[PDB]
Amino acid sequence: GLSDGEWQQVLNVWGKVEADIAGHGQEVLIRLFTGHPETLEKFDKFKHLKTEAEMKASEDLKKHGTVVLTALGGILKKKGHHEAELKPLAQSHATKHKIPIKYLEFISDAIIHVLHSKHPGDFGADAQGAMTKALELFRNDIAAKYKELGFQG
Ligand code: HEM
């Protein structure tokens, strides 16, 4: 798992996100959708977004970004003790949304990218290490739930 020092770094970085949850959420989803157009197809309600300008102008996309990052923030603040929070998310993503774990890898990478893009020179090597560990733990615990369900895609 993560050390206490690493968790402290994770939650310090997260303060940056909390100052502008909607803006961070929007940028994360736009990074995801533009880098990996197949991901947009999992969202019946975002399929109409044919350009990045349309994505940027979408208030509902910002809303979803807020929902996503709020859930992730709640999980991170549990510092790994997140079974109750994570299980239902894993299960809704496997059974209802059909989100392959690959897409969770994509969004994890997007979060790291957005942190650097919005805070260049202010997301240090130690902080990236810690946040990466936290996102890997999140993804890995979801992966265990996916395996339980036999879900691949
Ligand atoms: C940090 C990772 C993610 C978190 C914390 C997260 C969180 C959430 C939450 C809280 C909801 C609403 C409740 C629910 O349905 O369980 C949701 C809905 C949804 N998510 Fe995720 N999500 C993540 C990643 C992804 C990815 C990578 C995709 C697709 C590539 C995705 C696709 C969807 C879809 C299609 C819905 C339903 C949207 C709607 O039509 O209202 N999610 N997500």
From Swiss-Prot:
Top EC class for this record: oxidoreductase
| Source organism phylogeny | Eukaryota, Metazoa, Chordata, Craniata, Vertebrata
Q: Which reaction does it catalyse?
A: Fe(III)-heme b-[protein] + nitric oxide + H2O = Fe(II)-heme b-[protein] + nitrite + 2 H(+); H2O2 + AH2 = A + 2 H2O
Residues recorded as bearing Phosphoserine in the entry: S3
Q: Which domain of life is it from?
A: Eukaryota
Identify the residues that the record assigns to the Globin domain, covering every copy: 1-147
What this chain does, per the entry, is described as: Monomeric heme protein which primary function is to store oxygen and facilitate its diffusion within muscle tissues. Reversibly binds oxygen through a pentacoordinated heme iron and enables its timely and efficient release as needed during periods of heightened demand. Depending on the oxidative conditions of tissues and cells, and in addition to its ability to bind oxygen, it also has a nitrite reductase activity whereby it regulates the production of bioactive nitric oxide.
Q: Where in the cell is it found?
A: Cytoplasm, Sarcoplasm
Its family? Belongs to the globin family.
Q: Which gene encodes it?
A: MB
| Disulfide feature | none
- Residue numbers binding nitrite: H64
Stated EC number for the protein is 1.7.-.-, 1.11.1.-
Q: Which InterPro entries match?
A: Globin, Globin-like_sf, Myoglobin
Q: Which GO terms describe its molecular function?
A: heme binding; metal ion binding; nitrite reductase activity; oxygen binding; oxygen carrier activity; peroxidase activity
Transmembrane stretches, start-end: none
What is the name of the protein in this document? Answer: Myoglobin
Q: Which residues bind O2?
A: H64
